[PDB]
Design a protein around this ligand. Structure first.
Ligand code: NI
Length: 341
C-alpha cells in the first residue's frame, strides 16, 4: 500500500509510486527521475498519465517502451497547469532528467518535493525564491553530520589529472569507469575530453546516453571499443577478475587498466581527503574509489532547509526504521531552533 509520503494532499497526484498497482484516487503519477527504485513497476502496459521531464520521457519511451500518449513531458522552470493544479519542475542537480516538483494547492498551500537532489546555493535564486513553502518532501539520504564529501568539481579535477598523468606516462594504458544507472556522466566525459578520445561502451549503455539530450553527444561517445581509450563497464565488473577478463578481450592493445569507481559515501571519507586518495593494486590493474555524490552532504541539506524555513518536513529516505526517523527529527529541530523559524 502506497505510503503517505508518496501522496500529495488535496490532489489526485502521487510521486514515484509506480510499484503498488492502481492507487485509488490517483489521476496522475509523477516520476522525479529515471532510477529503478523510483520507477519500479513502470512498463509498456501503463495507461495512466505520467508527468516527468523531457529527458525522463525519452528514457520511458526508449528503455521501458511506454506509449508516447501516456508520457507527458514538461519543460523546466515553467508554470504549467496539470488537472487544474499549478505545478513547476525544477532541476534537482541529481542525475540527467531529475527534477524537484513545486505543487501550488487550491487551498493556498505550497509543497516542494525534492525527489533525489544535491542541494546547491543556485536553487536559492530559482523560482523557489518567490514564495513561501509550507511542506517539504526531503531527500534524506545523507542526513547525518558524518556525511561530508568534496564538491563535484574537486573530484573531476582529481580524475582528470590522475588519468592524464598515467596515459602520458604509459600510452598503452586503458582508462575504465564503472557505471550501473544514469548519473555521474561528467566523470567519464571529463576524462575522455582530456585524453582526446570518445568514450566507448556497450550498445545498451550507448542507447541510454543517446536519450539524455547531451549537446554534441555524437562526437563524445561510441560503440567501437577498439577505437576508444576510455571504456565503460558494469559496476559489478570493476574488480580484478572482471578487469583481467576485459584486459584480455581488447586483444593485446593495452597493458594496464586504470579504473575509477565513482561511489557514494564510504567510511574512508571519515579519515582521508580527496587529494590523498589511493587505489587497490593487483598487478597492472589499479581501481580508484572516488566519492562523486549526486545527493546533498549533511551541510548542503542543512543550508537548503534553513533557507527554505518550511513549516513541515516529511522524509522520503531512511524512513523504514524508527531509529532513523527519530534521529532525523532531532536534526530538523536543531536546524529550526538555530535558524528561528
Ligand atoms: Ni536517485
Amino acid at each position: 500500500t502506497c505510503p503517505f509520503y508518496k501522496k500529495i494532499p488535496g490532489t489526485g497526484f502521487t510521486v514515484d509510486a509506480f510499484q503498488y498497482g492502481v492507487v485509488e484516487g490517483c489521476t496522475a503519477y509523477f516520476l522525479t527521475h529515471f532510477h529503478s527504485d523510483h520507477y519500479a513497476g513502470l512498463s509498456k502496459h501503463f495507461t495512466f498519465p505520467v508527468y516527468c521531464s523531457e529527458i525522463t520521457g525519452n528514457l520511458l519511451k526508449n528503455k521501458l517502451h511506454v506509449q508516447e500518449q501516456y508520457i507527458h513531458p514538461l519543460p523546466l522552470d515553467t508554470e504549467c497547469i496539470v488537472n487544474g493544479v499549478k505545478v513547476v519542475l525544477l532541476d534537482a542537480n541529481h542525475c540527467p532528467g531529475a527534477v524537484m516538483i513545486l505543487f501550488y494547492l487550491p487551498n493556498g498551500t505550497v509543497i516542494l518535493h525534492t525527489g533525489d537532489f544535491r542541494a546547491d546555493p543556485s536553487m536559492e535564486r530559482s523560482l523557489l525564491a518567490d514564495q513561501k513553502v509550507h511542506m517539504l518532501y526531503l531527500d534524506t539520504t545523507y542526513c547525518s553530520p558524518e556525511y561530508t564529501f568534496p564538491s563535484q568539481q574537486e573530484v573531476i579535477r582529481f580524475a582528470i589529472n590522475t588519468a592524464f598523468e598515467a596515459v602520458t606516462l604509459n600510452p598503452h594504458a586503458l582508462v575504465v569507469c564503472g557505471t550501473y544507472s544514469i548519473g555521474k556522466e561528467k566523470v567519464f566525459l571529463a576524462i575522455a575530453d582530456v585524453l582526446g578520445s570518445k568514450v566507448g561502451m556497450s550498445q545498451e549503455k550507448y542507447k541510454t546516453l543517446q536519450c539524455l539530450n547531451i549537446p554534441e553527444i555524437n562526437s563524445l561517445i561510441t560503440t567501437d571499443m577498439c577505437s576508444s581509450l576510455v571504456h565503460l563497464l558494469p559496476m559489478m565488473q570493476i574488480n580484478f577478475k572482471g578487469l583481467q577478463s576485459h584486459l584480455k578481450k581488447c586483444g593485446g592493445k593495452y597493458n594496464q587498466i586504470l579504473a575509477f569507481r565513482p561511489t557514494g559515501w564510504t567510511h574512508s571519507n571519515k579519515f582521508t581527503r580527496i587529494a590523498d586518495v589511493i587505489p587497490q593494486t593487483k598487478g597492472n590493474i589499479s581501481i580508484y574509489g572516488i566519492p562523486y555524490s549526486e545527493h546533498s552532504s549533511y551541510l548542503e541539506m542543512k543550508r537548503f532547509v534553513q533557507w527554505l524555513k518550511p513549516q513541515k518536513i516529511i522524509p522520503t529516505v531512511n524512513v523504514g526504521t524508527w531509529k532513523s526517523r527519530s534521529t532525523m527529527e532531532k536534526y530538523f529541530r536543531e536546524w529550526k531552533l538555530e535558524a528561528g523559524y
